[PDB]
Swiss-Prot record, chain B:
It catalyses: a haloacetate + H2O = a halide anion + glycolate + H(+); fluoroacetate + H2O = fluoride + glycolate + H(+); chloroacetate + H2O = glycolate + chloride + H(+). Its EC number is 3.8.1.3. This is Fluoroacetate dehalogenase. It comes from Rhodopseudomonas palustris (strain ATCC BAA-98 / CGA009). Gene3D superfamilies: alpha/beta hydrolase (3.40.50.1820). SUPFAM superfamilies: alpha/beta-Hydrolases.
């Protein structure tokens, strides 16, 4: 059995037109939605969510298709796993709780859902934080030999099915543990609570969950990139006050200079960390978020 | 299993780095044929007979491929660099008394071949390369579109053991998917099933797959650097050269225009074919090669 890493938090299974969203819910105050990414689940926030819950009503949700959220059937354009669709789905979920204007922090895929949400539906957000990402358009635009080799999984997981699925199926534990370790500052699993690692491992052990992850990266290579391209070529900037927090040894890395192209009111800082800020640097991440969302 | 070369002998040729296996047939001027990935010498079985009508034809397994020995690699992937492979095949040809010969290569073998022509042009009377551009040129072109289309250049080049671990789960699937995906038909129908079995059998060995990954690691690092030095120096191949490519192959972004920057005497032509010219279009490939190599 898997551990409860949010002692005292409630658990909700929220219906939407696209399927259920699982969330842990805690605290009180202004509403704050937290969105994980790949290859994780909502439990990645367990080291910062208790502290945030001292100041906010904290909703820690599994992305569409991840963790214990339902997995909609995909299609030829990977539609349910595009960040545009994921953002619509999470907007519906928040409405089910009575939240139509909320604060939002995301990491990895969830940060992409978050800035896409801000571009499509800025009225929904009071403030936005994105953790260790650049826009999907910027990742692809900088593509060259060095980046192709340094950060290969974007193009690998986006290959047509069932190629990535069949490769991942032989020994899935090895792949998910290798990715978790590889993107940390030290390159091992020491930053992670082993109970959290087991949550990630159990999700990754389901071929249906792995297929969703590949669909997510297929969206990332195609429709998500196209959606982004339209905004940057039109000069659309996010007007929601924004924080870009990144790891000095992360994937996104200046990110603030990139984000200033995409957002008219953005602040930012690095933290000494690899990619997984809320687990590698929980006190600093929690502090940065509390201070940003409270101001 | 299955002998696909009527009237060819079988030879193990000694070198300082290990044995090279080759099928040997015909008489007349010497012509070396070099396969690539994920194949073996048997890929030439539909064109070698026609060539052996006019030439002494040596159909070799690349160093570390097929039945050739596998020299131990190192941190710089040295023995599977094209410079090293070319030196090893030059030694093998010297064992047969061939110090000036014609050479045709496909895929990795065509990279060995143009590297051989750049390093040791005195060894070659004429050179044909099938459906490739220089490694430098593919990497220079590695934008989003190319990262997606030739993802395996970055995936197979990831540090060991990441691709080795993934390929071990279902190697038959991967090799058959690669074979099919690069043909015009998109299935295995262009191949002799007996040939496919040769490729599957080789790919079934973890040691052979490791060699392939070392080959792509070389392709991402030393091979690229070697090419970059020639580009910077403005070096061109002086050997009479033929570039053949598939109308729906990988090299095509205009192949003859590219090769003219790398070679001072080159002619070329498209063939209605996917990547695997000698199997998808054996009659037209053989005819083109015969006419070119004939004096
Ligand atoms: Cl990024
Ligand atoms: Cl190649």
């Amino acid at each position: 059995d898997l551990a409860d890493l949010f002692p005292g938090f409630g658990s909700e299974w929220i219906n939407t037109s696209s399927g259920r969203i699982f969330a842990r819910v805690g605290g009180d105050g202004p509403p704050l939605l937290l969105l994980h990414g790949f290859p994780q689940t909502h439990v990645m926030w367990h080291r910062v969510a208790p502290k945030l819950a001292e100041r906010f009503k904290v909703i820690v949700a599994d992305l569409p298709g991840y963790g214990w959220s339902d997995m909609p059937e995909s299609d030829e354009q990977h539609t349910p796993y595009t960040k545009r669709a994921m953002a619509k789905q999470l907007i519906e979920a928040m409405e089910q709780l009575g939240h139509v204007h909320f604060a939002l922090a995301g990491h990895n895929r969830g940060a992409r859902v978050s800035y896409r949400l801000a571009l499509d539906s800025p009225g929904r957000l009071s403030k936005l934080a994105v953790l260790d990402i650049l826009p999907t358009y910027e990742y692809w635009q900088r593509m060259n030999r060095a980046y192709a080799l340094k950060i290969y999984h974007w193009s690998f997981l986006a290959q047509p099915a069932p190629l990535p699925e069949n490769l991942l199926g032989g020994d899935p534990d090895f792949y998910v543990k290798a990715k978790l370790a590889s993107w940390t500052r030290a390159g091992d699993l020491s930053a992670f609570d082993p109970r959290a690692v087991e949550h990630y491992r159990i999700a990754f052990a389901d071929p249906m969950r792995r297929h969703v992850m590949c669909e997510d990266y297929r969206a990332g290579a195609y429709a998500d990139f196209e959606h982004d391209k339209i905004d940057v070529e039109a000069g659309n900037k996010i007007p929601v006050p924004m924080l870009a927090l990144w790891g000095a040894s992360g994937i996104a890395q200046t990110p603030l200079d990139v984000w200033r192209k995409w957002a008219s009111d953005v602040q930012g800082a690095p933290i000494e960390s690899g990619h997984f800020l809320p687990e590698e640097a929980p006190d600093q991440t929690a502090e940065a978020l509390v201070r940003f969302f409270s101001a």
